Scaffold this active site. Structure first.
Site, PDB file in Angstrom:
ATOM      1  N   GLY A  17      31.436  76.494 -20.099  1.00  9.10           N
ATOM      2  CA  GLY A  17      32.396  76.496 -19.009  1.00  9.10           C
ATOM      3  C   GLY A  17      33.839  76.662 -19.452  1.00  9.10           C
ATOM      4  O   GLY A  17      34.161  76.518 -20.632  1.00  9.10           O
ATOM      5  N   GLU A  21      44.016  73.728 -18.182  1.00  6.93           N
ATOM      6  CA  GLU A  21      45.029  74.255 -19.095  1.00  6.93           C
ATOM      7  C   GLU A  21      44.418  74.752 -20.399  1.00  6.93           C
ATOM      8  O   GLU A  21      44.593  74.140 -21.454  1.00  6.93           O
ATOM      9  CB  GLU A  21      46.085  73.186 -19.393  1.00  6.93           C
ATOM     10  CG  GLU A  21      46.807  72.650 -18.163  1.00  6.93           C
ATOM     11  CD  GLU A  21      47.519  73.734 -17.380  1.00  6.93           C
ATOM     12  OE1 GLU A  21      48.746  73.891 -17.559  1.00  6.93           O
ATOM     13  OE2 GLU A  21      46.855  74.429 -16.581  1.00  6.93           O
ATOM     14  N   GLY A  22      43.707  75.871 -20.320  1.00  4.52           N
ATOM     15  CA  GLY A  22      43.117  76.489 -21.493  1.00  4.52           C
ATOM     16  C   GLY A  22      42.056  75.629 -22.151  1.00  4.52           C
ATOM     17  O   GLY A  22      42.033  75.492 -23.374  1.00  4.52           O
ATOM     18  N   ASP A 127      37.458  61.766  -8.027  1.00  4.70           N
ATOM     19  CA  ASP A 127      37.058  63.165  -7.907  1.00  4.70           C
ATOM     20  C   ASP A 127      35.550  63.323  -8.077  1.00  4.70           C
ATOM     21  O   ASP A 127      35.094  63.991  -9.006  1.00  4.70           O
ATOM     22  CB  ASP A 127      37.799  64.024  -8.936  1.00  4.70           C
ATOM     23  CG  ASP A 127      37.638  65.512  -8.683  1.00  4.70           C
ATOM     24  OD1 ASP A 127      37.566  65.915  -7.502  1.00  4.70           O
ATOM     25  OD2 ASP A 127      37.580  66.281  -9.666  1.00  4.70           O
ATOM     26  N   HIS A 131      30.059  69.380  -9.073  1.00  9.21           N
ATOM     27  CA  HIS A 131      30.421  70.051 -10.315  1.00  9.21           C
ATOM     28  C   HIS A 131      30.608  69.004 -11.415  1.00  9.21           C
ATOM     29  O   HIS A 131      30.579  69.324 -12.604  1.00  9.21           O
ATOM     30  CB  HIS A 131      31.688  70.890 -10.132  1.00  9.21           C
ATOM     31  CG  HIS A 131      31.836  71.989 -11.139  1.00  9.21           C
ATOM     32  ND1 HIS A 131      30.795  72.829 -11.475  1.00  9.21           N
ATOM     33  CD2 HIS A 131      32.900  72.400 -11.866  1.00  9.21           C
ATOM     34  CE1 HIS A 131      31.210  73.704 -12.373  1.00  9.21           C
ATOM     35  NE2 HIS A 131      32.484  73.466 -12.629  1.00  9.21           N
TER      36      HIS A 131
HETATM   37  C1  SJV Z   1      37.966  63.431 -21.985  1.00  8.66           C
HETATM   38  O1  SJV Z   1      37.002  63.735 -20.944  1.00  8.66           O
HETATM   39  C2  SJV Z   1      36.091  64.690 -21.211  1.00  8.66           C
HETATM   40  O2  SJV Z   1      36.246  65.398 -22.186  1.00  8.66           O
HETATM   41  N1  SJV Z   1      35.037  64.836 -20.375  1.00  8.66           N
HETATM   42  C3  SJV Z   1      34.007  65.776 -20.523  1.00  8.66           C
HETATM   43  C4  SJV Z   1      33.549  66.171 -21.764  1.00  8.66           C
HETATM   44  C5  SJV Z   1      32.518  67.099 -21.888  1.00  8.66           C
HETATM   45  C6  SJV Z   1      31.920  67.635 -20.789  1.00  8.66           C
HETATM   46  C7  SJV Z   1      32.347  67.255 -19.507  1.00  8.66           C
HETATM   47  C8  SJV Z   1      31.747  67.795 -18.352  1.00  8.66           C
HETATM   48  O3  SJV Z   1      30.727  68.685 -18.472  1.00  8.66           O
HETATM   49  C9  SJV Z   1      30.946  70.021 -18.405  1.00  8.66           C
HETATM   50  N2  SJV Z   1      32.109  70.463 -17.961  1.00  8.66           N
HETATM   51  C10 SJV Z   1      32.379  71.750 -17.868  1.00  8.66           C
HETATM   52  C11 SJV Z   1      31.447  72.702 -18.232  1.00  8.66           C
HETATM   53  C12 SJV Z   1      30.210  72.295 -18.701  1.00  8.66           C
HETATM   54  C13 SJV Z   1      29.940  70.928 -18.793  1.00  8.66           C
HETATM   55  C14 SJV Z   1      28.612  70.493 -19.301  1.00  8.66           C
HETATM   56  C15 SJV Z   1      28.442  69.286 -19.989  1.00  8.66           C
HETATM   57  C16 SJV Z   1      27.181  68.943 -20.440  1.00  8.66           C
HETATM   58  N3  SJV Z   1      26.171  69.768 -20.220  1.00  8.66           N
HETATM   59  C17 SJV Z   1      26.355  70.911 -19.578  1.00  8.66           C
HETATM   60  N4  SJV Z   1      25.266  71.736 -19.373  1.00  8.66           N
HETATM   61  C18 SJV Z   1      25.458  73.142 -19.014  1.00  8.66           C
HETATM   62  C19 SJV Z   1      24.140  73.892 -19.219  1.00  8.66           C
HETATM   63  C20 SJV Z   1      24.313  75.347 -18.777  1.00  8.66           C
HETATM   64  C21 SJV Z   1      24.774  75.386 -17.319  1.00  8.66           C
HETATM   65  N5  SJV Z   1      26.042  74.658 -17.184  1.00  8.66           N
HETATM   66  C22 SJV Z   1      25.883  73.245 -17.548  1.00  8.66           C
HETATM   67  N6  SJV Z   1      27.547  71.275 -19.127  1.00  8.66           N
HETATM   68  C23 SJV Z   1      32.181  67.400 -17.119  1.00  8.66           C
HETATM   69  C24 SJV Z   1      31.538  67.972 -15.882  1.00  8.66           C
HETATM   70  C25 SJV Z   1      33.217  66.479 -16.988  1.00  8.66           C
HETATM   71  C26 SJV Z   1      33.821  65.940 -18.085  1.00  8.66           C
HETATM   72  C27 SJV Z   1      33.399  66.316 -19.370  1.00  8.66           C
END
Ligand code: SJV
Ligand code: SJV
Lengths: 366, 389
Positions: A17, A21-22, A127, A131
């Site tokens: 994903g 901000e980048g 929030d 998603h």
């Molecule tokens: C400091 O706070 C954070 O860093 N928080 C967070 C860290 C890391 C992830 C975080 C997170 O997770 C994702 N965020 C964006 C894109 C993909 C994932 C993600 C994470 C784990 N598994 C998957 N699986 C994929 C499989 C293919 C299809 N799309 C889903 N996606 C969220 C929602 C919130 C906070 C996160």
């Protein structure tokens, strides 16, 4: 081709994903665990460490996302998270519910339980949306589970704990509606919320499930914030009940109002709006063989519940003609009535809300 | 303050002990740290991967990370309040109630999570069962540890191989090793938890031998009480020398040992209503009245309170040596509790807790004989949540 930053290692080709901000999120590895890694700039450090501390304080729970570790390099900060199969969003927009049955309802029980885990720690989710809801990888049996992220757009409350209920009530309808939203589509979700405009027309009173879903959500997305169920309240709602529990509830109610007077606060509460529940005369709404197998009043919920209590009691004594139509115990049995009398359990549940403090009717209310 | 990577610990704070365990910190998390020599790496990396494969479950200890030093290797583990062993030797069970029983469901559920991954735990004892820190509510949970002795069965089924510690070990290792081995060790922990520290196979230095011999003694569980029997019958099956006579991990979770008084009762109603049309020569009742005279103390009308004996309407036609009519009484008494006089409701007890307890105190073998005799209608969905799946 494959960066290694401490115990966090990832390959940029496998991108999961991209946002704010980048910030890009990859498919990496932490201590030989499959994990999702998010790299962030210094602009989001102060905000990142805030979310992270909360994860450490609440990752103990199954329905909360598990945080492993974070490391910083010359330019970025990488955050390790349990690798998940998909979001509740990818799950609704792509995955068919005909071969799941019980799975979607389970995800709300999980999500609601994890959302409650925050409330027990005096934390408020702000929030909450699909998603952010994460779907676990398939277990050995093949089952899955849900997990929350981002602990603080249409999922926002117009206005505390009651806020998360508002977001959740919209998520419930989202899973049930296979993608719709109670307060309309984007660019009108925010506005209609201010107005109080709700439409749950994907839930018609012509079916049992739909009504039971409406009563709960109506309370949740309610303008009156104090009129919203707590997280643990939602879990003891008929929305998550099994057919064994629906039936045994009717019976506990039926045996309970046996000595209560017709001028009783309860029966009035129970028969109030009963004509619509029993369709004027329930003897007419049911099958012929049963109708021929029956002092039961048509406009009476009490007599209707009395029939159901005594007919189950003597189910093994009933004719083969009736046992076939009534249905096997207990599933098709209670379904035989709820399908025909959908507002019954909703009306009964709220009307017997008086006896909530009674120990025979605690596991239904709390 | 020693620092090895992100894991840091203070040597003064020792939790246990050529492996020593410290109280450290990982990423501002409270953790228990174990220091190992290079001689124990082969066992450790093998152990950690199992934690990596099964820490997802609540009832499994959470592994965080390990760091390497010039001489040692440090392994970080979720800090726990105490062991099940320290929990029995110091904590009074009178002001906890169901907490100990819950620790076994947790323990049993986590053990099933491993069995779901074709894993066999071998060195299971209360020193491995760990007590989580108190939650905001004040509650706790149990978690399994020490997978140094753990067999990852290659595929599906079959049996492979056939050792640390003594007295908690199965005879099949002393060639039939399976999931059921963990049941034997686990079944002995129950008696340890039910009792104040006791063990079915006697005290130390003879636990090992008597297991081979088959000498068991559940004299902490007498048939003069309800719980003891339901606990004895379960554990008798669990610690059975005959390995195939041992319950699976998931069956135990559906045993009356973990049932509430509501389910004990709600079960009886389903049973009584089920035998409503049954003939006296019926296959179900023949199994049920078999050894019934001893269960109902020959004549149950005599063993119960006076008001009830006088409140047993003669038209129902209740035989003394008949269990089904007794269950019928409880069923018929339950249905019309609100229709009964206030005089009986006082002795019978308020519904449903004191009600079913009114009979079990007098008839401990009742729920046991019924459940064991009602195994026939198990495939019926009305009798799923009591038995399997
Ligand atoms: C400091 O706070 C954070 O860093 N928080 C967070 C860290 C890391 C992830 C975080 C997170 O997770 C994702 N965020 C964006 C894109 C993909 C994932 C993600 C994470 C784990 N598994 C998957 N699986 C994929 C499989 C293919 C299809 N799309 C889903 N996606 C969220 C929602 C919130 C906070 C996160
Ligand atoms: C992978 O191989 C490993 O290194 N495994 C293990 C690593 C680390 C610990 C491990 C571990 O843990 C302990 N081992 C020995 C003594 C105390 C603890 C321990 C751990 C966590 N909390 C507590 N609580 C204290 C509180 C004060 C009273 N006594 C109990 N004790 C076990 C059981 C197994 C494997 C471990």
């Amino acid at each position: 081709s494959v960066v290694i930053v401490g115990k966090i290692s990832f390959c940029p080709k496998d991108v999961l994903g991209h946002g704010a901000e980048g910030t890009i999120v990859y498919r990496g590895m932490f201590d030989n665990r499959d994990v999702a890694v998010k790299r962030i700039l210094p602009e989001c450090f102060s905000f990142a460490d805030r979310e992270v501390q909360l994860l450490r304080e609440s990752d103990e729970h199954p329905n909360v996302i598990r945080y492993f570790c974070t490391e910083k390099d010359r330019q970025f900060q990488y955050i390790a998270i349990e690798l998940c199969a998909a979001t509740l969003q990818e799950y609704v927009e792509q995955k068919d519910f005909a071969h799941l049955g019980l799975e979607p309802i389970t995800l709300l029980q999980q999500t609601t339980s994890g959302l409650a885990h925050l409330h027990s720690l005096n934390i408020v989710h702000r929030d909450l949306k699909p998603h952010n809801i994460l779907i676990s990888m398939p277990n050995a049996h093949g089952k899955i589970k849900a997990m929350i992220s981002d602990f603080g757009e249409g999922w926002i409350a117009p206005e505390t704990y009651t806020v998360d209920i508002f977001s959740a009530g919209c998520v419930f309808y989202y899973v049930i509606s296979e993608g719709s939203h109670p307060f309309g589509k984007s660019l009108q979700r925010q506005a209609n919320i201010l107005l109080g405009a709700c439409s749950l027309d994907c839930l018609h009173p012509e079916k049992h499930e739909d009504v039971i879903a409406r009563e709960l959500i109506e309370k949740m997305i309610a303008m009156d914030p104090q009129k919203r169920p707590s997280a643990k309240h939602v879990l003891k709602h008929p929305f998550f009940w099994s057919l064994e529990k629906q039936l045994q509830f009717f019976q506990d109610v039926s045996d309970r109002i046996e000595k209560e007077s017709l001028d009783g606060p309860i029966v009035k509460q129970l028969e109030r709006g009963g004509r619509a529940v029993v369709k004027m005369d329930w003897r007419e709404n049911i099958t012929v063989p049963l109708q021929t197998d029956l002092t039961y009043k048509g406009g009476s919920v009490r007599d209707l519940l009395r029939a159901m209590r005594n007919k189950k009691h003597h189910y093994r004594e009933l004719p083969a003609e009736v046992r076939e139509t009534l249905g096997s115990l207990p599933d098709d049995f209670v379904c035989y009535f709820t399908s025909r009398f959908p507002h019954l359990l909703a009306h009964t549940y709220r009307a017997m809300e008086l006896c909530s403090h009674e120990r025979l009717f605690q596991p239904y209310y709390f």
